[PDB]
Design a protein around this ligand. Structure first.
Ligand SMILES: [Mg+2]
Lengths: 261, 261
């Protein structure tokens, strides 16, 4: 299996422009043999809003709306599964979500559980929990951006059977790229952090999209500033066997009775 | 406030020799200003036992045994607090323990919750939970070796108000030195990993003792091979206030409803 990130530079409040850029890059990930392609957080809308009104205006329902139906169309055409960050309109409320689509259609969604900084003024805290989606050939867990900061995000997805954690991000702190391989190691999963690049109303994002292995190896890493795709080969038996030596299994050894109490 | 690790090379089954080495190094640390000094896991007995009988023969009681007695004397005489790893005899049972001793005497013990590899043939799994010890001027959490691998260990300690996690270790894998700064960051806590060095019945330990900070900065780090002390100044404001920005407080932001389920 090959997995891929798409590191792009979303244009704030311009979904058509972002649909165009994303298709172009998903097509190149597909040309490169990717079977699963991960896009950044909020790829359709951009990130740095001044008011909720400008995002609410453009934000789409899932699965009914344009971004899901767009991504279905690209999945169908390219034969890839896609995890993508999107602003989700749900009645009068907005979430910071990721959609999972396949060539056969919509698979499901995740709503960001740990909101970061000014996201608290715009978005409602995610309310679907940490979900894992079975694509047949692999189980894919989804978390978004600041979810990386809490070890419980990746751990919950790993317990739930994720082979790979798809991680749409709009990273601003320098830490996540160094921390991601530790997340991968401690759960014995692959992690695919699709970061954005660019500068948006004074806010500069760090890029450095990366794929990490269960041995904390960095299989692919992106620049700080360029749009690009990164594809890495993954070993599905290297993750599904939680043995770390012949006497320890990382899930058998956890002792939940002593945690957080 | 200054904290330290003592990185040393325990001689297997030679507690006299190890007490003597510990005393020289604790005093080097005490001279350099350290108020808290952390020693390696099983510093008195050594690690690489072939039979339970050989460690049972020499393993000491806590607090009345020779190791705790030794440590109380050193701490009475240096004015320091000491966290040290020690094989604990408790009746007819053995624990892989850490003791905390101050100038007053014995403050308390921690029993290693996550046993590693062959340890399960000698020791019982720890049964006192993850404990935080109030020294007045600081709260010290304690975990041992492989406890690092489970994010839940440091997280339990940090939630219980630990300002610093004292971490006696005998590392053989290379990952802990790379992970500890992420444990420090994700909990906004200081961590003190006191590793051993040496080769013990052919098993090589990796040294690389380190002190990490709440910003993922490594403040002090030791060699692969040499016996040494490392001392660093810690800022308690930087741990106690869990705010990473005006809108995010890492403990208020945890959403336990979605963790591990
Ligand atoms: Mg050094």
């Amino acid at each position: 299996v090959k997995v891929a990130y798409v590191q792009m530079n979303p244009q704030i409040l311009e979904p058509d422009k972002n649909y165009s850029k994303a298709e172009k890059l998903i097509k190149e990930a597909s040309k490169q043999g990717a079977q699963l392609v991960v896009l950044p957080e909020l790829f359709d809308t951009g990130y740095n809003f001044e008011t909720r009104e400008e995002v609410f205006e453009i934000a789409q329902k899932i699965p009914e709306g344009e971004t899901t139906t767009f991504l279905m169309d690209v999945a169908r055409d390219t034969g890839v599964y896609i995890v993508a960050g999107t602003a989700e309109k749900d009645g009068d409320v907005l979430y910071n979500s990721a959609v999972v689509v396949g060539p056969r259609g919509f698979i499901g969604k995740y709503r960001k559980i740990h909101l970061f900084y000014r996201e608290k003024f715009f978005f409602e805290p995610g309310d679907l929990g940490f979900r894992v989606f079975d694509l047949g050939f692999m189980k894919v867990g989804v978390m978004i951006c600041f979810d990386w900061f809490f070890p419980e995000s990746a751990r919950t997805l790993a317990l739930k059977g994720a082979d790979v954690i798809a991680h749409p991000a709009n990273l601003v702190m320098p830490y996540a790229p160094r921390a991601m391989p530790i997340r991968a190691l401690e759960n014995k999963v692959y992690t695919v952090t699709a970061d954005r690049v660019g500068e948006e109303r004074g806010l500069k994002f760090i890029g450095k999209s990366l794929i990490a292995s269960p041995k904390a190896e960095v299989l692919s890493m992106a620049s700080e500033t360029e749009e690009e795709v990164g594809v890495a080969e993954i070993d599905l038996s290297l993750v599904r066997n939680k043995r770390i030596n012949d006497l320890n299994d990382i899930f058998k050894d956890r002792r939940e009775e002593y945690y957080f109490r």
